[PDB]
Each structure stands twice: as structure tokens, then as C-alpha cells.
Design a protein around this ligand. Sequence first.
Ligand code: 0L1
Length: 299
Amino acid sequence: DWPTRQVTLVVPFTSGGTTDMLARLIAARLSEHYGQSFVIDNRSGESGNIAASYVAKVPADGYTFIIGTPGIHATNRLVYRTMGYDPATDFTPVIVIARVPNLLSVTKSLPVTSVADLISYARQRPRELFYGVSALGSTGHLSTELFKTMTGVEITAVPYKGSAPMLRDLAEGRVHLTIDNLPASKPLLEAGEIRPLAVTTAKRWPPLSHLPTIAEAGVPGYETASWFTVGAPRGTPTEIVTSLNTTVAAFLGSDSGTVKLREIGAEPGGGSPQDMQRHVEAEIARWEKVAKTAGIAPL
Ligand SMILES: O=C(O)CCCCC(=O)O
């Protein structure tokens, strides 16, 4: 019987970022499978805290879900003092949608063609260059802060409300570089508007197999990545979480779905609701260490 009416997917960022891109794919698929609209509600604000506060409070009926992010589940606690919700108690896991490499890029007029170029360039100019942050506490933000710490470069963060506006500013050179999710960056690469230097992952991204990893390009042992989830309000019927998990997992593990995800710069996730929970718990732990090492904590 579920669902008999429209389902809402609350997305914590505006369109043109990776969250929204993934959500739309998922929404399209769910709508076709179940014969009801799965509609996106883009509710921006405070690195996803506004959307996560919202979905924590809604009826646990299976007509509202959160497209979760590393901020919401794991990293916002490293930069926000109080959040409005407790991710640990307020949600129940559904599925990890994807794992996503981050990409180090620079604005075209920055005369650097490699990670080592970038490090020398920035070392000559301490505290003059600016980097773009898609959201406070995002993996990009903390990835850049870690990069800073591992290389000794001093560059100043500019927060934006999502990937989309940060990337327009990166294209114009109002910031000089970013580390941010591949899928949102990729259209700007293909169009020539920004210059990619390296992926953040431990291995190269196969469809851009000739971009090096940051680790092999000069920063031994550097590795970061981002990921996205479906979460439900605490108390959501188990039959619903299991049906939803199964449907998403069949899309992600299908040949067709893997192709769609890899075409936009994302690796299909999949697995069980408890797999999501393990992943979240490990991410909490490991980014908490990153943040301490990078000098990042709530004001
Ligand atoms: O969807 C966006 O625009 C931003 C997502 C940032 C996710 C992350 O923390 O890497």
C-alpha cells in the first residue's frame, strides 16, 4: 500500500550542487517505481541544519525524508555550536546513495597546472589567496583545511550557501581554488571554466583517470571523500524503510544506475540501513580527528 500519496525529499542545498543532482535522479527513479511523485523540497540554510531540524520534527509516516550529507550526519558538529536536532537520535537510516570524490580545482587565471605548482604558488603568497567553501563544515571545507595543514599553505576561506554559487565565483576568480564535490564541479571542467588539479580520494576516479590523486601529486596519505544518504524521521515504519532501501539499492547496483551515477562523478553506495549507520559512525570519528589536526572547531 505505501505510498498512496506524494512523498517529499528535503534537500539541504539549492539546485546545481551534488545533493540536489543525486536527489533528482533518486526522485525520478522512485516516482517511476512506486507510481507517486517523489518531489524535492530545496530547503537551504546553515549547512543543512535548517532542513535537518525540519525533518526531525515531521510526522514519521514515510511521506517525508531527508537527503542527508556529511555535514548533517557527521561534520556540522565540528563547526556549529548548537544545531536544532541530534542526527544520532532524530533520524533512522535508509541507505547511502553515493560515495563521491572531491576535486581540487583552480580558477583559469591562476597560473598553476598541478598540485605542486599550487603549493609553491601559495607558499610565495601567504594569506593573499582565497578559497571557496560550498558550505561551512562540508567535506570540501574540511578537506581544504586539512590540505592547508599538510602542506603549510595559508589561504582564506569564503563560505557560500551551496556548491552552485561558490562555483560561479570560482569561475570568475572571486576565489582562487576549491576542494568540492566532483559532480557539481564536472560541468565547469568540461566547459573549460575552471582547471582541475587532483581528486581527494586514495585512488583516481576511473572516468578521469589521468587526473592524479592529491596523495600521489605531492601530499602523502591525504584522502577525503563525500557521500549522501536517505534518512527518515525516527519512528518511520520498518516496512517503509525496507521497501525504500530495496528500491534504491536495486537502482544503485543495476548496470544502468551505476552508469548514470558514474557519468555525473559519483560512485553508487548501497547496502543496508545499518551499513549507513556504520559509515556515519566511522565518519564522525575520523573527521573529528581531521578537524582537531586542521585547527577547526565551533566559535
Ligand atoms: O549540494 C551542495 O551544494 C553542497 C553539498 C556539500 C556536501 C559535502 O559536505 O561535501
